[PDB]
Swiss-Prot record, chain A:
It comes from Homo sapiens. One of its GO terms (molecular function) is lipid binding. The keyword Transport applies. Induction: Positively regulated by cholesterol and negatively regulated by insulin. This is Microsomal triglyceride transfer protein large subunit. The keyword Ubl conjugation does not apply. Changing residue 170 to L: No loss on localization to the endoplasmic reticulum and does not reduce interaction with APOB, but inhibits interaction with P4HB/PDI, phospholipid or triglyceride transfer activity and apolipoprotein B secretion. It is linked to Abetalipoproteinemia: An autosomal recessive disorder of lipoprotein metabolism. Affected individuals produce virtually no circulating apolipoprotein B-containing lipoproteins (chylomicrons, VLDL, LDL, lipoprotein(A)). Malabsorption of the antioxidant vitamin E occurs, leading to spinocerebellar and retinal degeneration.
Curated annotation (Swiss-Prot), chain B:
Belongs to the protein disulfide isomerase family. The lineage of its organism: Eukaryota, Metazoa, Chordata, Craniata, Vertebrata. The modification N6-acetyllysine is found at residue 182. The gene is P4HB. This is Protein disulfide-isomerase. It comes from Homo sapiens. Gene3D superfamilies: Glutaredoxin (3.40.30.10).
Length: 863, 461
């Protein structure tokens, strides 16, 4: 690429320029208000030292900053200004100022940087500023696209040559440079980012006389758009005049001339380099943890401070080393330790992973609870990678003391396969190993408890090549295992639920070959109705209503009514079938029984929506067989399975003097729960198995069920600004869950009351910083809410059918916003401004189906 | 290569055209594995099939599982289960639907009625008496000339309608026996008037219009037997008389119903149902009725949506019922939505009380800015809002256009607004179009006032 040309200088002339750079941090409303930052200004001399005697466009220029000063960007700082009465030397340091004002050589070929020269022993931050200024001299007077190296790394660059200007647009996404950072590809939990870099070269009489560059970085939390920030960085380089300059130096090669100019001059890279803050008098991990641990008591995980400390500590862990982490783990007590395992696993660095893997013995039975916390934290890991998968694969291949934990490992492996498959890593080595391990572990049919494990893993991994096995198991008529396979099919996307899939599901629903359980049949029909059902698909299901066992008619009717009521995909085709009186009439649509299905909105906006869904299948006895609660979250087309909570029961008929349905008299009495949290299918939990175990455990006092801290939102950017400054964007979303259940039961009184309280505390933090080592500006915000959702179930079971009143109740929630902006000087408190807002979000009840409202009228009647 | 499950062919998607080719005459049962009527009919079907296997000819009995071979069921327009369709493979363009009885006898007797003549020739008065007595509905065509144009019209209408027996007589002693001077067509039935005489031109078309109209009884009792006949018919407007068998003066009450039925023969199906019967309890719940609220009438229309209608009066004299059906047919009766009783003094207090009955009247008033709290009576959130909402009413009690109201959303149905939580505050401005503005600001007197004064723009867009 030797045809373009950039800057040209005249022999024996010294160019006198002015140079300015400033940075602004803003809350980013769109219009920049009262922001923080700083301006660095100087004079600039440029002299041509050498030109290649071969006549080629090959030159060596010398660039010097003089009269460097650092000032406020904000005009109203007054007596709060960090620079008040301080010399440039006192602001940056004697040695730094000297370094900044020492000259720099730039060897340009065809107007592009061939080599940059400077003094080796200088601070990185300062070499960056110099590199920033030097990078502006690289340009092209004609239009085209190309790849260039400068402060920003190796980037694709586009030039638009106009009459009085050339425009240099840099493709910031394409830049090759080593910078830490990460961001989830999940639209609902993610952070949107825009980076622009535009440099304008002002032309007069074919020569550049000025250079104006503006760089912007915009971020916004997808979920909640009031949480955003902006970085604006500008550069201005103006030619003032020319003077008589040094005489040209003679030589065949540029390198020799440089050694002759000064032999301390060394070739250094033009690309900007990372530098560490270098903390002065800062406490160690153990000192921090000593304060943090006061807030992470199991008793008060619900307070916003707990979550705040959790998130803050995760930042510290992200810079700590294996040993200091391992130490803290080793000296901690049993009560707080689960919280610290949460924090350590969330950190998601090589060092934090190794510290926790080392700390946890999978053969121990004394650290079962911590094994779990570790593994669940990996499930929710915001940015998992091959290393995390590899660790898990090997834990599984190793020895594990508890088989529940062995199951958990395989289940979480499922999620990690899912996540890495959605992040262009479906063909990564450890992914293919874990795929073979799941798909293979499901073909080699071992013990029954082993098939369940693999099915749950596949329920998470959702590999399409697993579907034929799922169909085999759904059809097997193997009860618990058949339902599981069915519910796993239910998680796949519409293009995977083909005709062949629906053909199988039809045979299961219609019982063309053999009898299947009610739970399996209903789930199969749900998948059909939800996945582009044909006219006859819908017609046959409608015609079956009134001809199935007691509660199954009520349930299927409820499913269909809910499709109409909530305008689901198959709405239109169902309405077509409803035209016919034979299918749609007050005989078929008149059902007794308790079973139900209801979908509502939690929140709806033009952009985002949140839904709740409750569907309950009862036994003929009137005792619950299967309830599904589902909460989904949407942003545009993008979705997130926030929550699923499935409750199963069998053989509980003896707890009243009731009798089991036809067939169910040999069924052992059982109650369980299966849950999804933020797209992750968890390990199902048995409440009790068999009569003796039931009569063994047992009442109306709260009982912890799930407790834990989760790092849900996690966005990190390290940025090399074109000016040379260092910028960091960090967005973290943490929450604390605290679910607790209570039941009152009286056989004599024929009454039951169940209360499940879900306590949810969310804290979302943002942090923007620009650092130059002698000065630093930051903008941080904290948004917090202490939410609460309660589900209550009141049962009066004196006469079948029983009175059941269900309630979904969202508590009044406190909502608190914090902002802190600062300008700081490497020593001293600097300028700090803080604001606080504190509102209250109002509570409500969510309606369920109208029949439920009717039963609640009676339950809460005035007498 | 289909199997003979009790001498009955099993027809699948792949092998349907081949077997349709290999028999000139084919009777197919479209059924469902879970279907009760298909279960009850399955062995009688096997009988008629078996009886024709060792005595029959070319007519072959087949069955298709429509839940498995659904393409077929759709292709041939199956209605419910079972559906029996007769295929000739001389007309692959439309089979003939079987409509007769479900006994194995009725089948073969219907098959031979395909080969034999549409009507039996009645030589004398005794043969006439016989046929009239053979069925619930019978039709005789009196035609001097059997070869006549008129008479060939009638013989076509007697091939079409298969659920009624037809007779033709050209004997004058028969004519005079039923009091016919000229040619004609008489329908006889064992209910209601007993006899209907055809009028106007003797076209196949005009015949079917006469038969179909006069074949139906005035009133039908709702039973598991009559139910598929009701929902198989073409009348999509039903009036139901919920009449308990135990009620006093059952006969008198049904009598009035039978009377009213006359004025609306072709237009509204008059049905009575035993409100005391256990089987019917589910149906009572569908019409939101209790055993103790009977006797009562309800009218329903059966389209894409089912819509129920209540009479303005509670009296069940033949007059009130006719008056009901008449006002319905005009457009003067409103769909029955769940609603509480409007209190006498619903507008006595600063906060207006709205029910389902008067909701659209108040809220969608073009000249009024109405702000409504939709609540549940047991909800603590709604209970907490009540004092603030009261103070808001108090603020606006003398206003020129703002109305503060409330409605119990669990006790009243409104078609225009969906309530997704309790409480919900919705604003209905003074506007020509039915605009609805959701309020999502602070639940405070201050928040409310700011929103009301901005005309709905400061608290919600
Ligand atoms: Ca209005």
């Amino acid at each position: 690429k030797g045809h373009t040309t950039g800057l040209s200088l005249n022999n024996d002339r010294l160019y006198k320029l002015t140079y300015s750079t400033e940075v602004l941090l803003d809350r980013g409303k769109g219009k920049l208000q009262d922001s923080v930052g700083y301006r660095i200004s100087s004079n600039v001399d440029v002299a041509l030292l050498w030109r290649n005697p071969d006549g080629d466009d090959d030159q060596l220029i010398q660039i010097t900053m003089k009269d460097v000063n650092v000032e406020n960007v904000n005009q109203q700082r007054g007596e709060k200004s960090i620079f008040k009465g301080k010399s440039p030397s006192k602001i940056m340091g004697k040695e730094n100022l000297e370094a900044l004002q020492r000259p720099t050589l730039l060897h340009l070929i065809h107007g592009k940087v061939k080599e940059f020269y400077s003094y080796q022993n200088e601070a990185v931050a300062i070499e960056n500023i110099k590199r920033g200024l030097a990078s502006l001299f690289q340009t092209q007077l004609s239009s085209g696209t190309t790849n260039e190296v400068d402060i920003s790394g190796n980037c694709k660059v586009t030039y638009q040559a106009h009459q009085d200007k050339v425009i240099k647009i840099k493709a910031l996404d394409s830049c090759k440079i080593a910078r830490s950072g990460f961001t989830t590809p999940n639209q609902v939990l993610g952070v949107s980012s825009k980076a622009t870099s535009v440099t304008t070269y002002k032309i007069e009489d074919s020569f550049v006389i000025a250079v104006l560059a503006e760089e912007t970085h915009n971020f916004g939390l997808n979920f909640l758009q009031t949480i955003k920030g902006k970085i604006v960085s500008k550069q201005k380089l103006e030619l003032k005049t020319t003077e008589a300059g040094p005489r040209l130096m003679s030589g065949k090669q540029a390198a020799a001339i440089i050694k002759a100019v000064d032999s301390k001059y060394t070739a250094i890279p033009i690309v900007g380099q990372v530098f560490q803050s270098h903390c002065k008098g800062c406490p160690s991990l153990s000192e921090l943890w000593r304060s943090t641990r006061k807030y992470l008591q199991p008793d008060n995980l619900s307070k916003a401070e707990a979550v705040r400390n959790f998130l803050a500590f995760i930042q510290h862990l992200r810079t700590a080393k294996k040993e200091e982490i391992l130490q803290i783990l080793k000296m901690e007590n049993k009560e707080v330790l689960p919280q610290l395992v949460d924090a350590v696993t969330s950190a998601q660095t090589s060092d934090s992973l190794e510290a926790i893997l080392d700390f946890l013995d999978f053969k121990s039975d004394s650290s079962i609870i911590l094994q779990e916390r570790f593994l669940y934290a990996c499930g929710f890991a915001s940015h998992p990678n091959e290393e995390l998968l590899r660790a898990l694969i090997s834990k599984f291949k190793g020895s594990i003391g508890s088989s529940d934990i062995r199951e958990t490992v395989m289940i979480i492996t499922g999620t990690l396969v899912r996540k890495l498959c959605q992040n262009e890593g479906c063909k990564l080595k450890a992914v293919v190993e874990a795929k073979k391990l799941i798909l293979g572990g499901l073909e080699k049919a071992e013990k029954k408890e082993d098939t369940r494990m693999y099915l749950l893993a596949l329920k998470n991994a959702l590999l399409p090549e697993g579907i034929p096995s799922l169909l085999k198991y759904a059809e097997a008529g193997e009860g618990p295992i058949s339902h599981l396979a069915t519910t796993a099919l239910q998680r796949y996307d519409l293009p995977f639920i083909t005709d062949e899939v629906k053909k199988t599901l039809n045979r299961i629903y219609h019982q063309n070959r053999k009898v299947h359980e009610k739970t399996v049949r209903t789930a199969a029909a749900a998948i059909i109705l939800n996945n582009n059902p044909s006219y006859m698909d819908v017609k046959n299901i409608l015609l079956s209503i009134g001809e199935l066992p007691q509660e199954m008619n009520k349930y299927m009717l409820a499913i269909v009514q809910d499709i109409l009521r909530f305008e689901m995909p198959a709405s239109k085709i169902v309405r077509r079938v409803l035209k016919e009186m034979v299918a749609h009439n007050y005989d078929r649509f008149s059902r007794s029984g308790s079973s139900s299905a209801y979908t509502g909105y939690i929140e709806r906006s033009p952009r985002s929506a949140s839904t709740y869904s409750l569907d309950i299948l009862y036994s003929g006895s009137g005792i619950l067989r299967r309830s599904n609660l589902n909460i989904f979250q949407y942003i545009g087309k993008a979705g997130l399975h926030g929550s699923q909570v499935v409750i199963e029961a069998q053989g509980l008929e003896a707890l009243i003097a009731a009798t089991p349905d036809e067939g169910e008299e040999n069924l052992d009495s059982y109650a369980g729960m299966s849950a999804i949290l933020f797209d992750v299918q968890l390990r199902p939990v048995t409440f009790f198995n068999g009569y003796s175990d039931l009569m063994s455990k047992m009442s109306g006092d709260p009982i912890s069920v799930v407790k834990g801290l989760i790092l849900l939102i996690d966005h990190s950017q390290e940025l090399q600004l074109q000016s040379g400054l260092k910028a960091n964007i960090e967005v973290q979303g943490g929450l604390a869950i605290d679910i607790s259940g209570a039941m009152e039961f009286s056989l004599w009184y024929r009454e039951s009351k169940t209360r499940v309280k879900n306590r949810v505390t969310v804290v979302i933090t943002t942090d923007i910083t620009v650092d130059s080592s002698f000065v630093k500006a930051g903008l941080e915000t904290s948004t917090e809410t202490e939410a609460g959702l309660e589900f209550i179930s009141t049962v009066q079971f004196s006469q079948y059918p029983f009175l059941v009143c269900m309630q979904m109740d969202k508590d009044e929630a406190p909502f608190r916003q914090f902002e802190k902006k600062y300008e700081r000087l490497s020593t001293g408190r600097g300028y700090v401004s803080q604001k606080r807002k504190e509102s209250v979000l109002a509570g409500c009840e969510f309606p369920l189906h109208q029949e439920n409202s009717e039963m609640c009228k009676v339950v809460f009647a005035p007498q | 290569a289909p199997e003979e499950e009790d001498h009955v062919l099993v027809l699948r998607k792949s092998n349907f055209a081949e077997a349709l080719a290999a028999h000139k005459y084919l009777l197919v049962e479209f059924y469902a594995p879970w279907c009760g009527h298909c279960k009850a009919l399955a062995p009688e079907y096997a009988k008629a099939a078996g009886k024709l296997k060792a005595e029959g000819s070319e007519i072959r009995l087949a069955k298709v599982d429509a839940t498995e071979e659904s393409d077929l069921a759709q292709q041939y327009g199956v209605r419910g289960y079972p559906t029996i369709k007769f295929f000739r493979n001389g007309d692959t363009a439309s089979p003939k639907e079987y409509t007769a009885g479900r006994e194995a006898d009725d089948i073969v007797n219907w098959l031979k009625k395909r080969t034999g003549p549409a009507a039996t020739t009645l030589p004398d008065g005794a043969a006439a008496e016989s046929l009239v007595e053979s069925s619930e509905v019978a039709v005789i065509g009196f035609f001097k000339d059997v070869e006549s144009d008129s008479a060939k019209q009638f013989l076509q209408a007697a091939e079409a309608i298969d659920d009624i027996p037809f007779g033709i007589t050209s004997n004058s002693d028969v004519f005079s026996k039923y009091q016919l001077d000229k040619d004609g067509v008489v329908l006889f039935k064992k209910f209601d008037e007993g006899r209907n005489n055809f009028e106007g031109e003797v076209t196949k078309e005009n015949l079917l219009d006469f038969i179909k109209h006069n074949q139906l009884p005035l009133v039908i009792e709702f039973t598991e037997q009559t139910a598929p006949k009701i929902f198989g018919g073409e009348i999509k407007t039903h009036i139901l008389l919920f009449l308990p068998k135990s009620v006093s003066d059952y006969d008198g009450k049904l009598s009035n119903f039978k009377t009213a039925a006359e004025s609306f023969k072709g237009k509204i199906l008059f049905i009575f149902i035993d409100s005391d019967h256990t089987d019917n309890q589910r149906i009572l719940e569908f019409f939101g009725l209790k055993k103790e609220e009977c006797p009562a009438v309800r009218l329903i229309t059966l389209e894409e949506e089912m819509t129920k209608y209540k009479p303005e009066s509670e009296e069940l004299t033949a007059e009130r019922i006719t008056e009901f059906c008449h006002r319905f047919l005009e457009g003067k009766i409103k769909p029955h939505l769940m609603s509480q009783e409007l209190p006498e003094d619903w507008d006595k207090q600063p906060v207006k009380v709205l029910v389902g009955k008067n909701f659209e009247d108040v809220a969608f008033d073009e000249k009024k800015n109405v702000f409504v709290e939709f609540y549940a009576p047991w909800c603590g959130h709604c209970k907490q809002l009540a004092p603030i909402w009261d103070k808001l009413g108090e603020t606006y009690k003398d206003h020129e256009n703002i109305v503060i109201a409330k409605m119990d959303s669990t006790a009243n149905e409104v078609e225009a607004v969906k309530v997704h939580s309790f409480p919900t505050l919705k604003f209905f401005p003074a506007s020509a179009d039915r605009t609805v503005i959701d309020y999502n600001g602070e639940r405070t007197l201050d928040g409310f006032k700011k929103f009301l004064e901005s005309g709905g723009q400061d608290g919600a867009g």
